[PDB]
Structure formats: structure tokens, C-alpha cells
Amino acid sequence: KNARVIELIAAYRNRGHLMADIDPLRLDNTRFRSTLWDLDREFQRKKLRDILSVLRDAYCRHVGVEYTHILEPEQQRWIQERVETKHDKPTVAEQKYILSKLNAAEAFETFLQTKYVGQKRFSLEGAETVIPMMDAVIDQCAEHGLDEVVIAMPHRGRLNVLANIVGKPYSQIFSEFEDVKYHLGATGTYIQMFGDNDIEVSLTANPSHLEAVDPVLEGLVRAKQDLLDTGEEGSDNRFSVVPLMLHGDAAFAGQGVVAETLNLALLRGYRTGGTIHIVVNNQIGFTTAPTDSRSSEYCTDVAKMIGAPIFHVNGDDPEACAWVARLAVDFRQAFKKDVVIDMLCYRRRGHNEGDDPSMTQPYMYDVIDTKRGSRKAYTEALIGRGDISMKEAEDALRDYQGQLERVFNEVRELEKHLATAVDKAMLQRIGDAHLALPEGFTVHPRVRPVLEKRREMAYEGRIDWAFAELLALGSLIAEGKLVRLSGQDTQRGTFTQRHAVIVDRKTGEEFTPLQLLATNPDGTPTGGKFLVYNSALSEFAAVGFEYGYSVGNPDAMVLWEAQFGDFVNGAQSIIDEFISSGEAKWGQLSDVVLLLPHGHEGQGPDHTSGRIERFLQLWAEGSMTIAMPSTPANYFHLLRRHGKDGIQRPLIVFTPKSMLRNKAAVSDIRDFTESKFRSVLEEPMYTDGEGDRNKVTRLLLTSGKIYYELAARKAKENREDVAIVRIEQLAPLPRRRLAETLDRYPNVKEKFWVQEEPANQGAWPSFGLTLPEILPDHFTGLKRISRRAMSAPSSGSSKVHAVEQQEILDTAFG
Amino acid sequence: DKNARVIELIAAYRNRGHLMADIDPLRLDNTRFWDLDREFKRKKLRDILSVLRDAYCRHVGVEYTHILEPEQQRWIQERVETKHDKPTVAEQKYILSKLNAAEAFETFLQTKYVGQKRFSLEGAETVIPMMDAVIDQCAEHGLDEVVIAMPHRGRLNVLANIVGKPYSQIFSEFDVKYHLGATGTYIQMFGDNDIEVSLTANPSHLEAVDPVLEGLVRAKQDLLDTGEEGSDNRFSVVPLMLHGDAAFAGQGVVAETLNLALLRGYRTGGTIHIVVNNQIGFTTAPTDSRSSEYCTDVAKMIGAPIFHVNGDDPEACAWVARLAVDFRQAFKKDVVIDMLCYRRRGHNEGDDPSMTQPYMYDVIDTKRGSRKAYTEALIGRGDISMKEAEDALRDYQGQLERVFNEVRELEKHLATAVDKAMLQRIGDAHLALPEGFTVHPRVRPVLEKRREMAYEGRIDWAFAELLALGSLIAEGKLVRLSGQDTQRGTFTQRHAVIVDRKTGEEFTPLQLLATNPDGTPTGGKFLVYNSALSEFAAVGFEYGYSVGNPDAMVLWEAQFGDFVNGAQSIIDEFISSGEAKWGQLSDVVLLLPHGHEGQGPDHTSGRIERFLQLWAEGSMTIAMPSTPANYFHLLRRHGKDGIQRPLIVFTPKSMLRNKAAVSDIRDFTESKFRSVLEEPMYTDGEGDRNKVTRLLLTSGKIYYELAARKAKENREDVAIVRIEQLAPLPRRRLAETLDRYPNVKEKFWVQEEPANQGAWPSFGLTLPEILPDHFTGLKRISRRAMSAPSSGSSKVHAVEQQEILDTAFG
């Protein structure tokens, strides 16, 4: 008998959610339809009837709890202790407060659909309970003494969230009201009703691409946490900035970025101490039914990927919704892990102004047509339960009418109205840091020569690309800058060149040489820090995270590195919707750096190109800086200029692979100490040697590693009639420097743009059209030397690659 | 109290025994790890506990209590909680012969060639007898084919020891081999059945092939009349998908693809997943690659059973592979096998993996391979004699010599028009409702207007599309059309499926064209679905479907072309380049709603400039038709041309309801696709081509606005020529048309898109070089260059649009 009871307890805890009354529409009738002497028997010693009543109340009323999939027993125990108790009914005051939030939420919706045209698509009607729910989340975060709640959400109810959650005045929200308002960021202050705390509340900008903002929000919150010295990189472990992420049911189940972002939730490089997720589950996706949208019971099942607790709650019960919101915040604070709230509700209107939703979902909309709103339902229920008197209900309807008038009236009143050069001692310090190992640290035998070579380079020169990068980042840290660098295998470097983190051969302990530069020789901190991580195997979420990190902390140097530039197309949505366009669309600024290894080396179409042509196509005046440096010193100056220029603008860098180890691609100490970034470079024989520019009749214009091959062919054949000029900064085109450089070769009769990439790729598609237009006296007659146009970045054969490369060199010198 | 502790103990093993199972061959985590003769309800507690420890805490970690279906939990419980009969000596020797072949292959690959370390299967060889068991069990069920998708690790070993490709084929001109497709036949060793085994092509982008494989299998399943769109529920084409641990946890496409597993439009009857879990991703440790216990935790999204298996136990690995196939057959749902193993070598030739993972590699350095381990284990247990072990080693040696010798020996050596009757039949089909069907009051006028357009003309875009698809079905073609809200259409224009107002039953008017008037089938079919809210998986699936059935007409529709960038990896790695890279052909159609209408930067552009940039001769067809009839002929040409080539179409939004954008019946019955269109006043009216001094070249809906301005101002001096086919550029038709306007003094390319977008970036550079006698001096009229596809303000949009029209006629 006691064995059947234990199995019955487990059955309610595991599967009671399959029988909970969570759907306000009750669309599926089969949901519910599909001994007595044992009830008074005692089984802590409690009667079976009391055990069963606690289980039905906790798991089979208006909240479906999914938590037995959680692997941590202490988390399962924490939930079952809070859920399996006799809960004290809310005070009438708390019920009246929740009703006032529904009053404000519904008053906003009535106004939005009555005053303006084309607002049906944004309607929160049938889902208004999300407002007292969000209110409870933020109020509970303030109760925990947290610093800020950052929200990311799509368009549904966004202006309602601005007014009733962020607390933006109507004068600001409806100022010159057309749709861009549905994409902009916002900031406000939430002041507790029944408490004495306040908390900052912000909303991040986003495109119409559903869920694409998810990893952006995480990076933004992480940057804010790092600044407050809270969380993973902080002294305190309160993670005092809370991500509050809203979603729609169809998008949450279908978009891959959701799983990529959930995958970041506990990573040392990306954790934000747990995100509070709210899915506005109106059980429809435009005209699409959930059966065509997902292959699982709930739209939230993806959250089981990280063992997150899931609460399915009935949107027509705002008390249960507010209670679950507060429980979610307490779980997040206790375990620093994500909590998912699935609010079952409905979409009162069609998807947009034209849509009659009974055309495609007649059964659902015949049931929706019998529904009174959550506010009228909650007021009527409170009257029935004997919770409020007829007078108190009339006062509630008066408060609703007052809110409605206030928004109409207020909107009516609104209608009436630099050097980057460092001293040599900085280079020496960064070099010495590579040999300043912790006491008893055991360096891997193959890493030790790298550390010694770096000390040698810092004092004697011949500085390679990999060290030049760390000299730039280390000098920024010494000057007080926060530097965050990440990507796939970025700590060591894909080409075993970086070693930003070195690993103890015996203990596995990590040592970060550049972190020593965060402390001055006197011992005081510089205010700077080096944060370097290996990312998860993701492009979409990792790029979105780094973009959001730079938005969150504009003073940080933020770099994301692709394993090979060819994989960055996995993050195309972030490049198109945020990086390249966020500034022009929303006035949102980012200084994020994307490092994209690029170059034709015969390793195939997925290990050759960062798609220079695509980034040049996205570019417009002042949107991004695009570069392909050919020397370590120039890369050093490019990064230091980027971090010190006081301009928040993304930087795209096409970085080398084999050129990392090209013995000709090295720089002198004086290039770091007495020079600056050069958008255009000339051959050293003309700037520092005995070369004669006046002998040149053929000018080769190029970018990147092909320069060294062209220079080696020029040297082999003693071709004084040919000069090679490098365009280091591809965008904005350095018009003036390019004009000035070309003027010093007066006997040029022919000019060629030379590139490794196919004719429909690389810089030619844009340069071939732009250069003869911006500089007609220099580039009229400009011809191309490249690989033939191809549907792939390169051939799949290393043999075909070598022949094509030799054809380019032979044509250039033909 | 005693019995109560026993039930709680049974539940703990079933729920959490996998946390204590000896699954890791390396045993990296050390922290991982009397009353018993009393009978319980009748078995002794010691025998109850032994069954539980063997089932859940030995070399297999079973995760199944998260499954919501109780019959699935029961089915697993019953097969895993039994005293299992030890495999026959013939089976153990067979598993060892597969490990022998697998290891001999690896020794050869790493000894003969340079640069093969990155693809080494050393430490993970047990995946070969595991895959062998999967395919053998599929053959035992009498299934038709197993289609594999995998990344590069052990790919050539799979070709030789699974697909059964000869060494002469594998090492011919020997890295493109690591990406190509392959087909073979698997013949059972101890059975009398055979099964086809194929491998699909893939880029280096890990997991990107996942939805491609599902689409390819579904196309094959539809062809064999099996599964969702078939007579039997066998789903006799099985997807076998391999993965790496870091990519399976980090790539979003995995979740998007798992999300398709039970959908009516995308289900393949369950996929068998094998994760080669070597507990590393290049230099990255699992604690930096995922936020959960297992790399396979994403599979809990669809309640899939998960089996964590020790790669050093090939018997347990082969047993789990067979159980997985039985589960898939019983429940038509995905099964995930997490094979714990190790990566013996560095990620590549340069890598000393102890630089970044010294503890793991000091433990790997003590490991003998799973072959030497399994041979020694078979001697110790007394399952094979010393002689049989020597023969087993003689078999390895013999397999090694054979591959060296065979590769050594290798080194030495049409009209698209339809008739009036066809148009009328498609119009009439819209009114041929099933008995007792109740049409929605707002859908009924659409059905009656279509009958009216079929007989009287003024055919709009939406009907012209269905006229093209419907006529192809009547001719016997399989038409598969899908995308977000595609059944109704995003702009409420398609109504390819209509819903009974009273019962909710779906009716597909075009499906009536799959049956001849005599009652016999045409062989054609209309498969139309609302997709999940995915771009990456949905586009990958449709691409895969076109590969799987080259005779099918496959169309994927973006809600707005602006969202197709979510599928950029599929566009770049498969659609635009699969033919040139792997010789893999696809006739997939992408329909991208496009046009400047003031709805913002995410509801304006399908990024024409990006598709034109990807294009190279013979890779794709790119079009932006301006008339319903020209769109009809474009789709008909595409489906009937006998060429497998992707088609990119920039489709209208407001132009769907533009009263001037309608076609006559004669445009369907007596014309063809026109790559270049002239104004009807010159081809059919009283317009004089010799009066023209200014030529406006354009594409798409802006034509109607330019024509309206011409008509308002009676501008006989200006002509508007449309480029309907943007790629390949219709060079001969363009020259021929322009030669008909001899007094042209100036030419302009006119477009709605910003100067750095639309067709201008490519046309501005390409038109003066391919046709210098016509386009030298070509000038642009467009929106200014922008970092976004458009302004976010409808007011700015209107001003800019008027500026374009005023410049064109200035």
C-alpha cells in the first residue's frame, strides 16, 4: 500500500503538469478525461487524503511544474519544498495591486487599438497577464537588492512594457508616432510598491528577426555585471544584473539561436547568473498551429537542454502568474541558473489588420470569441470568491477608466505641443610578462620557446603578427582598458600562435601573461583587465554575445575571433541586423571587433575566405571599419587606434593564417614606438631603401599576404618597372592617402588591382566600381588580376589552387 | 519501510543510474564513483539490485524517464531490465573483425599520407561496429536504405568499412573526398537481407548537413510511398546522423532539426543519432563547450531516449545500436547514442594536445586501442582461444597489407504555354469542394474570382503561381511547397489549403489536378505545408528534398526575403556552391518577398545584391518577375527544363494587389518566359520606339510607378525596359531590345534599393563590360547607399521613392 503511495507521489511530481488546468481556452477536451478507505490511513506522518490534496494543489491546478528532469537533487528539493506546502492566499491589497496592473495593461491596449491604425499586430489582448508577471519579476529582483533588470523581447506588447514596466511617460513613447519605436532601447527606474527598494530597468534594441537579440541580451548583461564587479568576473557572486527574456511560443521552439543561447547559461566566459525567460504562449504562430511548429509537448522543452525548471501557467490566473514570477527569481538567486515561465494565453485579434484568424483557425477563434479579457475575468472572480465587495469592484472599474482617460489625455496634450605609438619599455614589459611565471608553474616544453622568443622580440625586434596582437592588447590593459577576447580555441589560437593563456603541464592551472599588465610597476591597479575565453562551438550566439558585450560596456575592447572567416556566415543574422546596421537603425553603438582568418592557401572553400565582398557590400559611410593588415606593426596600430579613438564603430579584420609564420612578415621595434596605422603601404625599398619610384611604369594595387609573393617575384626578376602598393584599410577607402601615394609614381602607364579571390569576390566587385569614380585621374583604366569568378570561395583541390596562384603572379609580371 | 526503500531504490537507478555508469573509457573524473537475501514482490533483493546495476550502472547510461509517453518508458525498461544472453562467439569474432578493419584503415591512413591526423578515428574505432550494427538491424527489419550524414572524422573509414567502397575508388587522385556523397549496398553477414547505404555530401560547417539529410530522406520516403505521405508506416529510409560532442551542443541547427522530427511536413520516422564523444573540441574542454551534464541534452527537447555508451565496450555499443533501431521502428522517433571515446592524436599535424589538455593526454598516452583491448578481453573471459586470437591478429595484419597493396597498385595505373482548358480546369478545381464542405465566408470570393480569372483573364500573381504549379501536377510532377504560413500565404493571397469553417478539415484545390478527368492518377501530387518558425533547418530541408528527388518541384518561401539571412550557411555552403564543389545538383526554388513599401529594414529586402554576388555561370537562376504570366512561365520553365539548378525569385507584396499587375489569358496560352520585357505600347500598341531619347532599365514593381508617371506626363521621349531574369544576364535579348531604340542618348539603371544594394553593384560593373556598345556611360538612379536595406520610417521611404521617380523623369 505504502509502495503505491510513493509511486503516486512520484507520478504527480513527474507528470502532474500533463493534467494541470493551464490553458485558458481549454481547446483539448481529452486533456482531463484521459481505495476510499486508503484515503484516511496515515503514511513525517500525514493522511493520504492530505498528501493527495497537497499534490493536486501543487501540480494539477493553474501551474504545471516540470522539475524532475533536473539532475541536481538540491534543486529538485528546493522546488518541491516551496511548491508542496499550504500556500497563504494573497492579501486583498496584493490582489488589488495585481488588478491595478491588469487595469493599466488593458487600458493601454484599448487606447493603442482605438487611437492608432495598424497596431493589431502588436496587440497584447488576451496576454495582458504578462504585465503583472513582469512587474512581479522586477519587484522580486528589487526585494533581493539587485541593481538592474535588462529586458529583451519581440514587438508584441512592447509599448505596454515601456509604459507599465520600464515606466516611460506617454509623452516619450508616443512622440511623433507613425514603428521604429518597436525596435529601440530604453532605460528607466522601477520603485517598489510595498517595499523600500528601487531597481534600474532597461530594454535592449532588436530587429524584427525573432530571438536574434537573445545572445545580445546575455552579452550586454555580462558586460554590466563585469563593470559592477558582480558575477563570474566579480568579487561578489550576486550577479546583480538580471536578464529578463521574453519570447513567443512558435519562435522559442523553431529558432536555433534559443538553444545556442541556453547553452551559454553556465559557461565561465558567458554566464549571467541565470536568465528569467517568459514565453507569451498564445498557442499560435501567425496562422500556424503548435502541431506544425514543434515536435514536443511544450514550446519550452528546449530549456530541458540545461536542466532549467519550467513552469506552465494559466494566463487567466494573474495570482498564479505573479507567484511563479517571484518563485523564478528566488530559484535564479539560489542556483544562478535559468528559469522558464510558459504563460498560456491567447491572441484576441488576428495577426494583423487584414487577418480574419477564423479563416485558418476557426475552432480556436470561435472559443476566443466567447472569452472576456483577463481583467474582467479576474475582477468577476474576486467578486465571486468573496475577496472584494461590489464597492471595491466598482473602484477597480474606476481605476481602469481613470488609466484609459489618462493615456488619451496625455497623448492629446502631446499632440498639441590620436597617437598609438608606445615607448619601447611597454614592449619590454609585455615581453618580460611572458617569463614572469607564478612560483612552481610548469610550462609545457613546446610553449617555453614561445615565451622566450617573445621576450627576445620585445627587446631585439623581428616582432611577428601573434606577438604584435598581444603587444596591442597588453598596452591597452596597461593604459587601463578592459580587454575581452574570445572565439573557438582563442586562448591557444587555432594556428597554435596566440598562447594568451598557458596551461601548467602538471596541475592544469591557467596562467594569463597579459593580466600582469593590469598592475603598475609601483603595484597599483591600472583599472584594466584581460578577459580571454574559449567559446562554445557557436557563431550566431557567440557573435551576438560579443556585440552585446560592447553595447553593455562602450569602454571595453571586445574582440571575437572566427576559427576561419568562412564560418562567420553562421552569424549572418547578427552581422546584418546588429553589427552593420544597429547605429543607423536605432542609434545603438558598438565597438565590437571581428577577427576573420582569411587567405587562399589550398585548404578548400571553407578554409579560405572571410567573404570580404559581403562586408564591403554591407558597408556605408561611418558604419564600420574594414581592414586586411599585411604587417604585425600595422595590425598593432589598427587595434590601438580602434580602442583609443573615442568612436564606437565595429571593426572587421581579415587576419592571416600561414602569413603568421612568414619570416618576411615581421616588424621592427621603431614601427611600434615611432609610427602609426598606415591605411596605405609602399614597398620598403622606396621608403627605406635604394629603390627608384620614377622607374615604375606598372602599378600593382593589392591587400593582404599576396603582397609578399608579388614582392618575391619582383625581387627574383629585378623588376624595377613594377611597384606594389597595399590597401590596408579597405573601408572607408583611404582616398587621400591613396591619391598621395600614387602621385609619387609619375611614370605609371597601367594599373592593376591584384587579388587572390575570385573576380566576383574579394575587394574587386566594390573597388572596380568605386576607385574609378572617387579617383578618376588615378583609376580610369584600372584592370583586374584575380582568380576567375566562382560559385564557391575557391577550388576544393590544393593542386588547382597552386596553378591558379602561379597564374596570378605570371599575369601581374607578364 | 523496507519495501518502500526498495521501490525508491528501483526509481533512483531508473532515473539517475546513468550518473554512476562506467561510461568514460578514460575515467577522467575520479569523483564520479547486509540485507539482500530477503524476497520482494517474487525475487531476492540481491537479484533485483544486480539487474538494476547491470542495466543502468555498467557500460551503458540510459536516460529515458524524461520521456512523456509511458508506453515508451515501459518498452525501454522491459528490454534493458533483463538478464541479457551473452553474444555468440560468431558475433564477438564479427565485431572484432570490424574493429580489425577499422584500425587497419587508420594505421594505413596515418602512415601512408601526410595531413591526415585531423581526420583520425583512433580512439573512436568502435563507431564502425556500432554503425555496422545500426545498418544490420535496419536490414533485419527489411528496410530499404540507410542515408548517412557525418562530419570528416573517420569519413574514409566509413566509406570502406560501412558504405563498402573499394580502396581504388576512395584513394583515386588522393581532401574533396571528405565532402562527397557515396552510394553502396550492405549485405548481412548472419542474415539473408541486404540494404542500400548512402552518404550525403557536406561542407566543413559542422551540423549544417543535419536538416539536408532529413529533407533528402523524406524525398526518398515520399518516392517509395513510405511514411507520412505513404501507404505504409514503415519509414523504410532511415537517417543515420553522426556528430561530434562540441558541435552537437553548440550549433543551433541541431535543435532546429530535432524540432522537425515529428512534424507532418518534415518527419522521417525518427533519426538514429551517433555522437562521437571524444570529450574534447579541438583544444576546448566540455566545461567551455556546454552548460549541461551531457553533450546530448538538447535531444531531451523532443523526449528522445539517450544512451551513453563506453567506446571501449564494442559489444555494449553494438547492442545499443540495435536497441536504438528497434525503438525508432516501434515509435517513429529519434534515438540518440552518445559514444564516449577519445581522440588519440592532436586535432592536426602541428598540435601537441598536452599543451592545452595535459591531464587528458597523459591518460590517453596509457590507453591501448579498443581493438587490442577487446581482443585481450575476449582471451581473459575465455570467449576465444589463443589460436583464434592469433588468427584475429593475422586478420588485422592481412587487412593492413591489403589496403597498402591495393592503393600501391592504384598509384601504378521546350514550351511552357498551357491551353485554355488547363487554365479552366485549375479555376474550376477551386469550386469543386468536397461534399458538405463549408468554405469560410471571406475565402469563398477568392475561389469564385479564380474561376472568373481562368475564363475571363486579368489573372493576378497569386493565381498565376497556382496555375503554374497546378499545370505541372496535371502533367505528373510532384510539387512540394512550404514556408511560414505558406498554406494561406503571408499576404492572405495563396489559399493553397482552405479550412472547413465548421470541422477544421483541410481541402487542397490543386490536389484535384493529380487525377485525370478519366479518374486515373497523373503521377503528380501537391504537398503543401506550413513550416516551423525556422529558416536554417527549413531551407536546408528543402534543399535536401530537391537532392533526394530531382524530379520534384521544390519551393521554399520566406515570410519576407529579409529573414532568409537566418539560412545563410545553407545558401552559401549548399545551394549556391554544392554543384561546383561536389557535383551535387539541386533544383530548389527560394521565393523571397521583396520590395520598398515603407515597412522598415526587415520587411523590405531579400538582398538581391548578395545572391548576385554568389552567382557564377551556371550556378543559379535569379529573377524578379513583374507580371503574373512571366512568373508562371519562369516556374514552368524551371520545372520542365531538364536541368537541376536553384532558382531565386524576388516576389511581390503590395504588387500582388496592384490592378495593373494582371495578365491576359493569351500570356499563358501563347507566350513563353521573357527575360527582358518592353512596354506593351511598343510591342502591342501605337507607341513609337524612334521618339525615345532616354532609356530607363529596371526590374520589379517600380516599373508600374515609372509607367504611371510616363502616362501622366505623356513622355514619348522615355522608354522603360525590364530585366526579369537578373542572372544569367540575358545578354542577347538585352542587345536585341536596346537596338530597337536607335535615338537613345542616355541610359539609366533605376532601382528602389540603396546604391550599395539591389542589382546596381553587379550590373554597374558587368553591363558595360559584356555589352560596351550599349551600356558605356550607364548611370544609376537609386536610393542613397545605406548600412541597412531601408529607412525605419515610412515617411522617409515615401520621400525617397518620389525622389527616384522625379530624377528618372527630370
Ligand SMILES: Cc1ncc(C[n+]2csc(CCOP(=O)(O)OP(=O)(O)O)c2C)c(N)n1
Ligand atoms: C527570424 C524570423 N522569422 C520569421 C519572422 C516572421 N514572423 C513574424 S511574427 C511570426 C509568427 C510568430 O509566432 P510567435 O513566436 O508564437 O509569436 P506571436 O506573434 O504569436 O506573439 C513570424 C513567423 C520573423 N519576424 N523573424
Ligand SMILES: Cc1ncc(C[n+]2csc(CCOP(=O)(O)OP(=O)(O)O)c2C)c(N)n1
Ligand atoms: C560551423 C563550424 N564552426 C567551426 C568549425 C571549426 N572546427 C573544426 S573542428 C572543431 C572542433 C570540433 O569539435 P567536435 O564537434 O567535438 O568534433 P571532433 O573534432 O572532436 O570529432 C571546430 C570548432 C567548423 N568546422 N564548423
Ligand SMILES: [Ca+2]
Ligand atoms: Ca573605437
Ligand SMILES: [Ca+2]
Ligand atoms: Ca529545373
Ligand SMILES: [Mg+2]
Ligand atoms: Mg505565438
Ligand SMILES: [Mg+2]
Ligand atoms: Mg569532440
